[PDB]
Design a protein around this ligand. Structure first.
Ligand code: MN
Ligand code: MN
Ligand code: MN
Ligand code: MN
Lengths: 512, 512, 510, 510
């Protein structure tokens, strides 16, 4: 308990966001607004459409709010004479103006601002299960769903004794109201929102609750619930079976490292075969390459890639997508102590390749190296596409920024396809240089096949960490490889975003 | 053994300083000076009083020394024709001139210079139990006692095989000779001096001798000797009973953390009720927020606050003060290893409040938080005053300096009363800002009730560490809270000072 | 560029006016004189019956009062409120001020008044838009300051405002107290004017406000106010033995200057005060060059001079019964071939020699010459010397962002100054006064003293104060108040105008 | 010293000539025209039958081909090979070029051609020694560049070569393609000349190549080429509102200058391009002074200006059908009393105000004035603006040593530019184009923007591009290509001449 309550919370998790449309809303609630707190979000043009004037909260104060609000900001009023289920004299209404401007590399619905406007609005909300209606004028259903899900205040939290109430402040029930029946459907969006939120909680959970054993436990429960096969290679079995990357990185920790692989073969298919691999470093101390304090804070999030692929998988099974899937979680804690793998130790990864460790804090690529080899050589099928996701490098932020995950991809078409999924999902990406001939030289070793950390830090370092992982692909793998460095997109204002699963979901959804 | 010899040394400890006056000295020693080494300390004016000319070591060379000595310095002569018990032809006499100038924030007797003059004089002394007479012209008995006690070379030491002789160089027996019978009395001053010296030894003992178990052992022995009740919550009992601050900080160490509480109910009373709480970090590595070498040296002293409150308590029981007292020692070693509490872990202190750890090297406030809650909510009485003492922040030195402990106090009167005890004892203090409304914001957490380390280091950081401790006061506590940051005053010239107990003793002595 | 900033400072008038509920009701008989209203009060003050009688009170405002959170605003559109403009809606912001305040803080909590008001005024776009701020606190002076510093008269060069006096004139404030205030509205307006002028001086960049343009501003005010003014500039500083300020500033493009203003009141008085201020218009560090992230904001290293200058300005304008000198220690601490070196030995005006061991500890050098000038070179004998400066990073560590550290040689006067801090909202807190421990940190083997401490962890705020005290005239038997206001000079990366009101309140009660 | 370097640049001619196997066989009927031969090809190319027909082929060369390793050279003495000199032995180096190349790289792998050739030429001692380089690749332009930059025409002041134009003339190269190349040999020679001139400009130290001597070189070329040239120097920059470039450079001994060349082609064309280049002849950091190990190599901070200048030079010489302006933003970022400060507020030519928060982010300031000049102050309306600069250390982190980072506002043009990178061997790769996220990193409370990012870990290469884009004329509706070439400008601590060929290829295909 403490941990087993967090586990129970993850296993049963439902979202607090529902989706509908204006017409269905008007048919279901003819006895007034079903809430007393309303957020209306749209562009300058969308907020002046005639249809707005027919919405159940519209009144002269709301019309004034629309005239006064600034681009990128909310404007709040108390609306009088709006009939509502609670029979309040006043309904709280917040108008948020979303910019219309978006670059070619961004989601044109600007869910980044939808999220921040919504977040700011929901800070007024005190009480338990307070019903909030969010009327949105965008029809970009998936992107709005994600934004709403990640702003709905279902984050992990241990404030005020909430450890006893599933580490959750249940202060809001959201209803998102689209102009017309959305595509995807409300039931699809709810699955997506659920995965976004579950991912968010997994990431911001501290390591004293979410460690390698409790993460594995969650995945085992989902596997049983979902009818999926699950394989766990734990501890000494990793050493005995030659998985020296993940074993060495994790052997020092109190809870043993584990490679957890889930499988899904759809009922009637199969359109493609995809292996997912995720970096599940439940805490990163640095090992003997110990991080300073201000770089060690937030390293509970170093399992973000594992949470992403796990929650993406979860969504794919739940939406019964016609794709055969494996999901491999590379679970370890990078600890410091007498047993810690050393700067100079030589490891033999499952691939058979030897690695001279020159930075113990470059540990994620080691666990991934064992993971991608496992996915491409040790499992029941031959994937057409391998996607690995990880919170890998500080350099990622320097290169592609806080809101675009860096992608290292060995095929131009599949890179474009993935970027497209980023833009539709709002979980945006951008390419880093793919040039194996320049990256491989950064890991020259005089005593092993390679080192794990670059000789020069100023030579496409996001790409080189990708290349290191690629070095442990099975030599028979002729498929597409998408490597995702999501170090910074995994969080915003010092809170987890749930980034990854929806990007992934949208990508898989569009495979043929 | 090694450790058990240090323990035996602490348990039986007596001082090597005695106190008397000129008249009693002349009645007891009519067969000449009882020593051949004499130190005479006074201001420029005090050294020219007529009474000096009647003192048993006075002679023309001593008169010349008085004329030539410089303010703040000693001047040594060999005095011929002074009759003495040893029948030496020459008596060594050192004249030390103490400045008369003192600020309103300082002890007007300037024991700081008394101590340094005496220390310098005692460096001439080689042999065993060499008798030294120190004639002082100040009547500030308590301050002189402390200065003398801390300069008498009864420090911890392991030089030259002295591990077998109680880790003590017994090179000096001091007699301090006041102008007239002192207030406090010689027997009172001897108790004070004993506590000052015991505190000095505790602080400068290395952790391989004084750890959480051997400190507890010392306290248990004193409790039995003194007729005081003692309560020990050790190891897993701390975890099981919800003391998650002190437990987590200390769980990684080889010797388990412990909360040790002593109690004293006087025979006939009670004038006030006082809880003492002390930071007993027997070594501070930093934990995962590992200190660099030059900040890790001297961290054997991170138990100074526990030594202070323990030795103050000791003095109060021995002088049979009319005050009900608890003394809680918060004992832990802040170690590094696989089991170390992490930067991101969330702890539940005994207070029920959750703490997100953002610096494992801000550990003292965690152990104190459990300590002050224990003192204000878990013990047999309701204190009127809580005093916590600790070597807390480097900032303390920046703010109030090497010789003034920083005090964070929630009541103006009690702060003044405490400053007054500082000035009388020579163990001087100075206030840091008390402004809870500004401090509490420095520990905002997105996932717990609070963080443990400030967001900004340049915003009254000595005060904020005080506020953190205050956050875990029992919500029913309506009393006075005195928080003492004594990081720098705990040592001088790279040796422990024994700071704390006399300050404390003087404060308790004057309560009504 | 610079002469437009100068003209802007010289002619400066506040945008804040003060009144009370009763006078407001008598003058504005057609309803509210504005369509944007802020009402600020404690939880209790916001539930008094008197609130219900105020001209913006209505059911939406009542609901706002019920929903607002402590320390936050809650905005509504109020319908059916009579207003001069006959708008259907009046914008009303309810701000709840905490009632809780420590013994070291202003009990009216102007810190939160200022942040609530500032947040409310972000909604105001257009030119000279009228805003009424109804406050339930009677702490007039503290409210005035908070309002003044939040009224958006800050220095700014955005959007071509260089041509409009480097000022976005988007707001006219009227502050409405429950009853006629003490001090009076005309007094509060002078205070507010000085707060705002100080704010603009501090946040002006050095390419506009250098040693010559600051001196120019002071010279203009002196002429306007009938005050005598003395300027010792450049080589005159060297020739006359002011080697502290001269050496610190001699490398800069614009020469160092000691500028001293004097005021003898119309009516006789006994109280005599010298003010001395650190006017380092920019601090590069000199050869002890600051890294970039410590060099940003060093345009504010003249905050102490701005404080004393604006306090002086208030005292003259209110005709306070105190004889006053105000010495501005103006220099730019530059780097170059001519820069004073780490090892150079300087002879300050006091005749004491100083071995420079950190060229970035320059403020105490210019102050050392300043305080000697004020205590020995000057036509009168001050009873009190107050020096104000943005001196040490340590100040923040010790006393924090909102409390200036004070080093004071007299207990009573220190309490008196703390009291002025609490009444003005420009709060202070003591640092250790113990000369016997500070003086040892500046031992030199070749000069009377060094300028920088040997140990940084030994009451360093206090030691910088002690250094300045070392150059007091040996005649001076008076009270010395040293104010380290490094952090209180700014908030959210904008100048606060801290200093002048603290000072004004102290002088007012002397 | 300086005028000898100037004369050297003005009269510069390449030492590389281009031909093909058939023309070589017709002209050199007495056998090989050299006694030092390099043969470079892939594993497959080196085993074709055609190799056996080449004039240095013999059994030792055949053995060399069998033994050489991928990415390395293998040297022999070839006996019995007919040569003009009738030497018994001809020195022959076989270099195997990898065939593998990523989609982001030049498939002829000129990176390895260059390093193989460079290694081979280390064996060459004497003056004007003839070397034949037989290449099996038909990627003419990429080979030309590689050869040009490896031909040992670098700047050098070793062994008194200051008197011999700062040039070790130890090699004459003849590059022999399999068939008559496209582009033609006379075209490749112009390209090679520009590559080499660019190389020399970059690695020249600032005591030779400052703002005046660079301007002098450009003025000479303009006269020689019949191109108009405009120079705005020193106080004319201040007086005319070019406060970015003026402020950055005003502290230096040699005044800042905006130098703009123009070319209208003989034959009519529609395509109009403005080039703008960062010409920071030395970057100390200014008051944000660089540490020594970051200050070394900052003579190369004018690489972008050299690139655009040498590209322009090529375009004029090949008579390309494109109207061209070339603006060199020349300044030295110096430290001293007059240095622009961290906090100063500048007014760029665009009229936008900039609060300086890092004086070492100076290149974007000079470029901001440059791109505004090109888009608003100039006789024509460019369809495309290309700015080139050695901007950020982050560039290397993001896109590496051999790929310049490109920030481009149009997808198609970005692809077009990447394609020119791959054909030229002077390769690029995109950085994130997302203005809506970049602009927030330069929020200022007192000016339109800051110059340095608030967060360093938020697409910092892209944000420096965005800063420059902020000073584009608001009229400008065209394509903007921003090139951060900080690391590709050098290799093994020697200038590469990167930029001009990339540029030339892009313009050629426009
Ligand atoms: Mn790591
Ligand atoms: Mn610590
Ligand atoms: Mn300075
Ligand atoms: Mn620079």
């Amino acid at each position: 308990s403490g941990a087993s309550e967090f586990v129970r919370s993850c296993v049963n998790f439902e979202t607090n966001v529902e989706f509908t449309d204006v017409d269905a809303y008007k048919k279901t609630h003819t006895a007034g607004l079903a809430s007393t707190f309303v957020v209306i979000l749209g562009t300058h043009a969308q907020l002046r459409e005639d249809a707005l004037k027919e919405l159940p909260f519209y009144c002269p104060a709301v019309a004034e709010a629309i005239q006064r609000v600034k681009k990128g900001e909310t404007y709040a009023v108390l609306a009088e004479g709006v009939k509502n289920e609670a029979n309040e004299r006043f309904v709280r209404v917040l108008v948020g103006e979303v910019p219309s401007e978006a670059s070619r590399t961004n989601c044109p619905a600007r869910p980044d601002v939808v999220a921040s406007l919504l977040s700011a609005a929901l800070e007024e909300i005190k009480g338990p299960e307070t019903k909030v209606d969010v009327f949105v004028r965008s029809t970009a259903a998936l992107a709005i769903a994600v934004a709403a899900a990640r702003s709905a205040k279902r984050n992990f939290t241990a404030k005020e004794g909430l450890a006893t109430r599933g580490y959750c402040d249940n202060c809001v029930r959201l209803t998102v109201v689209f102009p017309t029946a959305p595509n995807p459907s409300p039931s699809e969006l709810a699955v997506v929102a659920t995965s976004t939120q579950l991912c968010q909680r997994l990431v911001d959970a501290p390591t004293n609750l979410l460690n390698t054993a409790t993460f594995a436990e969650v995945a085992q429960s989902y596997a049983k619930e979902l009818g999926c096969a699950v394989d766990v290679i734990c501890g000494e079995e990793l050493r005995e079976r030659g998985y020296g990357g993940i074993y060495s990185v994790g052997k020092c920790a109190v809870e043993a490292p584990r490679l957890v692989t889930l499988s899904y073969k759809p009922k009637d298919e199969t359109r493609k075969k995809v292996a997912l691999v995720g970096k599940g470093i439940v805490y990163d101390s640095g090992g003997l390459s110990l991080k300073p304090t201000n770089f060690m804070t937030g390293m509970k999030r170093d399992m973000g890639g594992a949470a992403a692929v796990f929650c993406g998988f979860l969504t794919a099974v739940r939406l019964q997508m016609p794709i055969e899937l494996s999901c491999t979680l590379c679970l370890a804690e990078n600890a410091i102590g007498p047993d810690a793998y050393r700067n100079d130790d030589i490891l033999t990864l499952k691939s058979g390749k030897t690695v001279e460790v020159n930075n113990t804090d470059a540990e994620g690529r080691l666990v991934l190296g064992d993971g991608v080899f496992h996915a491409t050589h040790e499992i029941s099928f031959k994937p057409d596409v391998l996607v690995d996701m990880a919170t890998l490098t500080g350099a990622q932020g320097i290169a592609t920024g806080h809101r675009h995950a860096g992608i290292f991809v060995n095929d131009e078409e599949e890179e474009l396809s993935f970027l497209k999924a980023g833009r539709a999902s709002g979980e945006t990406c951008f390419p880093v240089l793919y040039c194996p001939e320049y990256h491989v030289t950064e890991f020259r070793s005089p005593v092993a096949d390679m080192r794990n950390s670059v000789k020069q830090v100023n030579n496409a370092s996001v790409s080189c960490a990708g290349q290191f992982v690629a070095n442990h692909l099975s030599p028979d793998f002729k498929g597409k490889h998408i490597h995702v460095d999501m170090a910074f997109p995994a969080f915003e204002n010092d809170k987890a975003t749930g980034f990854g699963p929806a990007l992934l979901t949208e990508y898989l959804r569009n495979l043929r």
